[PDB]
Design a protein around this ligand. Structure first.
Ligand SMILES: CCCCCCCC/C=C\CCCCCCCC(=O)O[C@H](COC(=O)CCCCCCCCCCCCCCC)COP(=O)(O)O
Ligand SMILES: CCCCCCCC/C=C\CCCCCCCC(=O)O[C@H](COC(=O)CCCCCCCCCCCCCCC)COP(=O)(O)O
Ligand SMILES: CCCCCCCC/C=C\CCCCCCCC(=O)O[C@H](COC(=O)CCCCCCCCCCCCCCC)COP(=O)(O)O
Ligand SMILES: CC(C)CCC[C@@H](C)[C@H]1CC[C@H]2[C@@H]3CC=C4C[C@@H](O)CC[C@]4(C)[C@H]3CC[C@]12C
Ligand SMILES: CC(C)CCC[C@@H](C)[C@H]1CC[C@H]2[C@@H]3CC=C4C[C@@H](O)CC[C@]4(C)[C@H]3CC[C@]12C
Ligand SMILES: CC(C)CCC[C@@H](C)[C@H]1CC[C@H]2[C@@H]3CC=C4C[C@@H](O)CC[C@]4(C)[C@H]3CC[C@]12C
Ligand SMILES: CC(C)CCC[C@@H](C)[C@H]1CC[C@H]2[C@@H]3CC=C4C[C@@H](O)CC[C@]4(C)[C@H]3CC[C@]12C
Ligand SMILES: CC(C)CCC[C@@H](C)[C@H]1CC[C@H]2[C@@H]3CC=C4C[C@@H](O)CC[C@]4(C)[C@H]3CC[C@]12C
Ligand SMILES: CC(C)CCC[C@@H](C)[C@H]1CC[C@H]2[C@@H]3CC=C4C[C@@H](O)CC[C@]4(C)[C@H]3CC[C@]12C
Ligand SMILES: CC(C)CCC[C@@H](C)[C@H]1CC[C@H]2[C@@H]3CC=C4C[C@@H](O)CC[C@]4(C)[C@H]3CC[C@]12C
Ligand SMILES: CC(C)CCC[C@@H](C)[C@H]1CC[C@H]2[C@@H]3CC=C4C[C@@H](O)CC[C@]4(C)[C@H]3CC[C@]12C
Ligand SMILES: CC(C)CCC[C@@H](C)[C@H]1CC[C@H]2[C@@H]3CC=C4C[C@@H](O)CC[C@]4(C)[C@H]3CC[C@]12C
Ligand SMILES: CC(C)CCC[C@@H](C)[C@H]1CC[C@H]2[C@@H]3CC=C4C[C@@H](O)CC[C@]4(C)[C@H]3CC[C@]12C
Ligand SMILES: CC(C)CCC[C@@H](C)[C@H]1CC[C@H]2[C@@H]3CC=C4C[C@@H](O)CC[C@]4(C)[C@H]3CC[C@]12C
Ligand SMILES: CC(C)CCC[C@@H](C)[C@H]1CC[C@H]2[C@@H]3CC=C4C[C@@H](O)CC[C@]4(C)[C@H]3CC[C@]12C
Lengths: 112, 125, 277, 277, 277, 125, 112, 125, 112
């Protein structure tokens, strides 16, 4: 199935500075309908992952405007404008276009 | 609100069988499939199955196929999953997550992964 | 205990062809039904009892035609109108078809009475055409809509709203397709064929007969290719026809295109006045 | 000394298109043939000798139409009915075609006698139309069914039952296709063309002629595209047309669709009464 | 803030099918329009005011038909004629369509006056058909061509010359498509439908009506499939219908083929004289 | 009953030729093809050929093509196979197994491998 | 042609206990018609192989209910509910969808 | 004549942002897209972007995507390009070259690369 | 994307003698329309590259007849009939058929 590599594996970030995580696929994520179904999750330590953005750029209701994503084809990127103290955890990117769905490697965001 | 509640953590000997309940409430249970996702400790999230609560059209992942049977209980709006012949590396955490959309004229699979259960951890000793 | 295969969306040509067919049907039907209904029900009126039946047929066709723009918009873009409008659209769609079919059956029954029992049975014909018709057609058509009234609603899939029928499980759609067939095709067909056989036999041992025969044959010629699509879909659902899944997608596309083409039953009624009348 | 290439099953659109064509043909033919046969053979009766010929044509068409649901079910699902029903279906299918063709030839011969020898030959016409016709049409049609009577049976392939013709070797099907052509197309065609040429010549040096001419041309226009399909298949079989195997599958699909479309010869007969009559 | 997908050139069958359709339309239209115009405007003249309207329609159709060979050559080969000829072709193309539509609207208005106010309103009919028509049709049609007059020109892409419309930005084409729809389809359609409704109502409470009704329905049946193509293209442009890009190419091909088929409005006018006249 | 009977075991020198009979009874012999399968001792089963008894449309495997000619005797309802230029490693066991289905309108190949012959062993010395 | 690997090569089993053999293909075993033609054989020592199950799950007439198979796509499995003393021999899985047919490696069932 | 004029050479520290103007004259600016090409010193010419001046349908190269935003100023007939998070190896020369062709019925991309700007060099220190 | 290798990397040429540079692609440069869009550039030291020939053989206006090109499929060649003292510089071949466009390695012409 489709395999996605996510970089960087470890991303030390300093408070008040933007950061970017990007994951690349092995097959073009374009559906026959005409959309791209790739969404990003954040998993805080000890609780189930939650949804941040669904599709390439649409933002899931209930999260701040700091999180934003972009990309097309086989390259996608998620960026955080400002890093607070509550943005520590794992981040995953997954696709829902080709049966079966495949998750990402995972990126952990520390505090520097 | 829409939410999914699971059972407690379990420990079982190798070769046994484990069934984890997944009770869902807050929406029409018979119009969204359910996908079972397992995350090994210190490893990337993995997928192992999916069942359509509309008419029980189960599907399994290649790596686990032949050892899991997963069914639903529409009367009480619960979804189960049975795993047998447990191995040493099966100690992990299982998440029940809504997936797909089933209807009379629409039976697509690219609308979901929105709400997740609390998750349960199973270990083999 | 079977694996699922997910339905794939219609081709781009279908996405363009359905809206134009719907728009043409709407444009023809609105004008035709408005004109026939207005003339029959407001000034010149109707000389014959058959015209009275045709007025009910025209009203049902108008009620159906009213809801076409929602169908076209749903076919092209996403659903935006709301849950109540979804329910109303489904209810009207279910009402109009059964109303039209039973009005046709009533017309055939009236012909039968007018032909064989012409001398004896004028009072029964008048009574049937004046009072009984409401209970005959409008009551059961309204009654058969309770399943749609409960099981039709809009679902939120991500950012896309879907107006469809969400049944508790699979067998409900099989049962409802079977009642659709049994009430649309079989029983009224049996009544119409039996009635016309008796009239033909009596005649062997009429402009009106020709005019009401062409309407019925043209109605069932439009509806016929849809019902084989439904019958096959139901058999495939009950694990009797396991031909794969490409066959399933092909028959789904066939059902869609065939119902789009068979929506012509509302347009067919006013035309016969222009040509034959 | 050749390599084999295995026939691939028909496309999904064909699997859906054959049943609807069969259902439409059955629905039209059953009603039309029932009505014509009933009127001609039970009450009003027939004014002219040609109507008498048409009654035999109608009976043959009814006998053919009776077996269509088995064809549709076999086309969609597996065979379940049994070996005896397979044999009966094949026998009836073989009987009806030859019966219809020879009835058409008899009609042409009667026209020839009615036109050129009208004064001299009334007694021969009556005798031919009353007594000789049975031996002429029904005896050879029954006689030609012995190959089907022996070589048609159902075979058990795993869990699927197949109702087909299992010949001892390849050349039998070539011989039987050749006799099919020689008895359906060529000899009756020669008789009909010669007869109409003589009538045309005599006329140069009629409503009835027009009505029986349209029936024949419409019959052979429906059957014509099938016989080129058979002719080409036979030539390909005898290693005379070695165009590959994709050509073989294409011509097989052509044969299937063309026979499905040419089954309209049973529906064509009652319509002409409605239009011309 | 979106990614671009580049339009792909039409299929080879389209590249061959457009020239033959254009050539057939040119050959039919030139002869038909030349004949009708010559007879109406040079010898026998016209008995009725409607024939006078038809003469303007014929002149507009001739003006359109004159430019077809350039369309065919551009469809097949590169543009060679020059910038001035590109501008003239676009101006004539824009003029003829609006002229024809407004002449049809005027014919409907004249019918309305002739039917309901026949006794009172002969002088207004004569005045409208003699003097007002020029200001009504020819002035606005000329006025609406300024956007084409400015934004139509030939561009040098390598060694290939392209005659097209180069707008300052995207929204201009949306605005101009909207005015195209509002002035071709909606407003004249509203006028025609309202007028015919009033005539039908008055009649309920005519060879001329039939002849001018068939022309209008045949005109809007040819133009109808094009306007859904434009409407959908405009909605796709404004990020309201984001169905992808294969859908965009499909709708572009649909627009091209549909305008090629809808160019029949120039050929339709002279034929009705041959058949109905 | 339906059954297939073969000949006895044979031993032949290298470079010779061997023909093994395959007599079939219990069903219409002219409506099912026959496939010849060879199993080398201590090795996985292998396929080498197929002949259609309907009209003799033979087909051979790539590894053995050019050294085998296989024909049928419809009169006595028997199927043969001839192998020439035998090598040292040809010592094995040959099975005659019904395959396919041949008819006037149906000539498929995915219905068979049901009944097998007793098998014969040939050795080279 | 299609190549199928069967595992395990040797499967020691204890009397009265279930066992499973699974073979994986290299190409999807789905016919244009819509079925999967993969069947399993058992060869006792000294006699010709016999058919146990034809297609993925259908059971050939004349064998007990202990043998049962499942799978789809490119993965298939055959399982024996109870192992008796007469279930000793080689087991093969073969396909009939793509010309020519290909057999399996073979699995031998011992007694433990 | 048709010509494209760029800005001057620039030097910036790592992590900064640079915008290079590309003023075009001599032809209708709103009917030809613009492609930005960068040539690293002592290396082969490389492509990094393209913007359609008709309606601003930008597109970026994979290697640079996520760090460049490029826009046009139709009022003064100029095209810009913004690059942020500059690295050490970004010292190179940037050329603004006309590309494509945009029209009402023609929006192809294989007609261009004809006229080039004078080019500007940017360095990081 | 399409990758083109250009040979030779260094081409010493003597004044008054013809020379040839040829570059080979990795995918056939044939458009759906039916043409091949491959063009050649020359870059003198210190100025922007200019266009010499557009498409396989058509000559861009403003250059002498000495430059001429040919080829088809995946092989193309540019040849200079006579080498003067002003023909010193880099030469590139690029394609415009598949999004995105790709340039060539580059060939430098010296004087021998
Ligand atoms: C007398 C009855 C005639 C009634 C015909 C009604 C219209 C039925 C056409 C709807 C067919 C839906 C299209 C369809 O089946 O699509 C596909 C097949 O369609 C094609 O490729 C072409 C076949 C349809 C066009 C035939 C035109 C019919 C004649 C007019 C399925 O294949 P895949 O899944 O690979 O796409
Ligand atoms: C005057 C005589 C007109 C009579 C026509 C009778 C109907 C004949 C159509 C049956 C054709 C069977 C389909 C066929 O040949 O299939 C394939 C070709 O079919 C196609 O792709 C489209 C061609 C058939 C559609 C043409 C429609 C005819 C006009 C109505 C063979 O290619 P492959 O093997 O790769 O699938
Ligand atoms: C009542 C209204 C009937 C009005 C019909 C008007 C003509 C519309 C046909 C123009 C369609 C353009 C062709 C088209 O969409 O091309 C492609 C689809 O076309 C096909 O493959 C066959 C479908 C078109 C042929 C249908 C024939 C219609 C019946 C006569 C798009 O797919 P791709 O992008 O992969 O090529
Ligand atoms: C006289 C009337 C009933 C004829 C009606 C014919 C219409 C319904 C037929 C004619 C050609 C057909 C199209 C031919 C090709 C395709 C492409 C395929 O990928 C999807 C279906 C689609 C788009 C078909 C849909 C049905 C279609 C439009
Ligand atoms: C291209 C499309 C929109 C044209 C649609 C035209 C249809 C709607 C028009 C054409 C002719 C019209 C009919 C002409 C005459 C009569 C008789 C009158 O006593 C009742 C209305 C009735 C029955 C009209 C109804 C509307 C009608 C059928
Ligand atoms: C929710 C909707 C679909 C419910 C439908 C109910 C209403 C709209 C229907 C039910 C029965 C219908 C009536 C049935 C009979 C007649 C007599 C006729 O001479 C004029 C129209 C008239 C008076 C109909 C008008 C519409 C009507 C009142
Ligand atoms: C797929 C759908 C749209 C096809 C619809 C076809 C229907 C509307 C067509 C098929 C055959 C047609 C009939 C064929 C012959 C006649 C006889 C003529 O004297 C009056 C019209 C009449 C009665 C036609 C009416 C319309 C008709 C019934
Ligand atoms: C006026 C009458 C005779 C026209 C009859 C036309 C019918 C028989 C033609 C029209 C379009 C044709 C179809 C067009 C496309 C396909 C797809 C192909 O993969 C199988 C054949 C199939 C399904 C054809 C079968 C025959 C077909 C349905
Ligand atoms: C859509 C389909 C099912 C309609 C089928 C209608 C056919 C079967 C009907 C339509 C008109 C009918 C004909 C009308 C008149 C006559 C004359 C009578 O003396 C004998 C029966 C006969 C010849 C009828 C036979 C059946 C017939 C042909
Ligand atoms: C196995 C089947 C197909 C054998 C067919 C034999 C029977 C059904 C056929 C053979 C000859 C036929 C008869 C031929 C002639 C006539 C005279 C006609 O005025 C009424 C029908 C009638 C009486 C036919 C009835 C059906 C018939 C008896
Ligand atoms: C592939 C198959 C189904 C095509 C069948 C076409 C046949 C039924 C068609 C083809 C040409 C048609 C004929 C064309 C012209 C005429 C003249 C007219 O005054 C009476 C009808 C008549 C005689 C038609 C009868 C039906 C006909 C013969
Ligand atoms: C009665 C009239 C309106 C029917 C008009 C039908 C014409 C417009 C239809 C019939 C068949 C169609 C063609 C069918 C197949 C193809 C191949 C595709 O790759 C491009 C479109 C193209 C070339 C279609 C263009 C439109 C077309 C030519
Ligand atoms: C195959 C194609 C080119 C044939 C084109 C024939 C057309 C252009 C011909 C056929 C019949 C002709 C018409 C026949 C009769 C008349 C009446 C006359 O008072 C004015 C001209 C007019 C209205 C003709 C115009 C041209 C016409 C419509
Ligand atoms: C550049 C082009 C398209 C400008 C069009 C303007 C000219 C060609 C048009 C504008 C108005 C037109 C006139 C409008 C009305 C009439 C009256 C009629 O009884 C004869 C033709 C005649 C005299 C027309 C001839 C053509 C005409 C003069
Ligand atoms: C895609 C485009 C070319 C299709 C064009 C179809 C138009 C020209 C066709 C579609 C339906 C046709 C009409 C159908 C019925 C009638 C009734 C008849 O008594 C006169 C002709 C008339 C009024 C036809 C005229 C032509 C017509 C309007």
């Amino acid at each position: 199935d489709v395999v996605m590599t996510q970089s960087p594996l470890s991303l030390p970030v300093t408070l008040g500075q933007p950061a970017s995580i990007s994951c690349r696929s092995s097959q073009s994520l374009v559906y026959t309908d005409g959309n791209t179904y790739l969404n990003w999750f954040q998993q805080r330590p000890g609780q189930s992952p939650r949804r941040l953005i669904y599709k390439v750029s649409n933002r899931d209701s209930g999260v701040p405007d700091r999180f934003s994503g972009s990309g097309s084809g086989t390259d996608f990127t998620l960026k955080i404008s400002r890093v607070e103290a509550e943005d520590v955890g794992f981040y995953y990117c997954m696709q829902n276009t080709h049966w079966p769905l495949t998750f990402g490697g995972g990126t952990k965001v520390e505090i520097k | 609100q829409v939410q999914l509640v699971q059972s407690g953590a379990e420990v079982k000997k190798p070769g046994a069988s484990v069934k984890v309940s997944c009770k869902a409430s807050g929406y029409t249970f018979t119009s969204y499939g359910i996908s079972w996702v397992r995350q090994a400790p210190g490893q990337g999230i993995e997928w192992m199955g999916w069942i359509s609560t509309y008419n029980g059209n189960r599907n399994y992942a290649q790596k686990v196929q032949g050892r899991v049977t997963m069914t639903t209980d529409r009367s009480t709006s619960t979804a189960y999953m049975d795993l047998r012949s447990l191995r040493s590396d099966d100690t992990a955490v299982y998440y029940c997550a809504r997936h797909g959309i089933t209807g009379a004229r629409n039976y697509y699979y690219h609308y979901g992964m929105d709400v997740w259960g609390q998750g349960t951890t199973v270990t083999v000793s | 205990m079977k694996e699922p295969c997910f339905r794939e969306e219609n081709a781009n040509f279908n996405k363009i062809f359905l809206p134009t067919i719907y728009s043409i049907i709407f444009l023809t039907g609105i004008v035709g039904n408005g004109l026939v209904i207005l003339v029959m029900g407001y000034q010149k009126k109707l000389r014959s009892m058959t015209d009275k039946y045709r007025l009910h047929l025209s009203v049902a066709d108008l009620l159906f035609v009213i809801t076409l723009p929602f169908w076209a918009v749903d076919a092209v873009a996403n659903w935006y109108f709301g849950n109540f409008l979804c329910k109303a659209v489904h209810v009207i769609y279910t009402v109009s078809l059964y109303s039209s079919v039973l009005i046709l059956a009533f017309i055939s029954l009236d012909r039968y009475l007018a032909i064989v029992h012409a001398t004896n049975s004028q009072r029964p014909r008048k009574l049937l055409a004046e009072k009984v018709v409401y209970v005959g057609v409008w009551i059961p058509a309204l009654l058969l809509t309770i399943p749609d009234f409960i099981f039709a609603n809009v679902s939120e899939a991500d950012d896309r709203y879907i107006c469809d029928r969400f049944y508790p499980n699979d067998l409900w759609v099989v049962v409802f397709q079977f009642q659709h067939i049994m009430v649309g095709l079989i029983l009224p067909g049996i009544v119409i064929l039996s009635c016309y056989c008796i009239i033909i036999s009596k005649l062997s041992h009429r402009k009106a007969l020709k005019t009401t025969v062409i309407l019925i044959l043209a109605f069932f010629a439009c509806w016929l290719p849809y019902y084989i699509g439904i019958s096959i879909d139901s058999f495939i659902l009950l694990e009797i026809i396991k031909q794969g899944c490409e066959f399933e997608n092909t028959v789904h596309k066939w059902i869609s295109i065939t119902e789009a083409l068979a929506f012509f039953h509302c347009c067919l009624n006013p035309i016969l006045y222009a040509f034959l009348g």
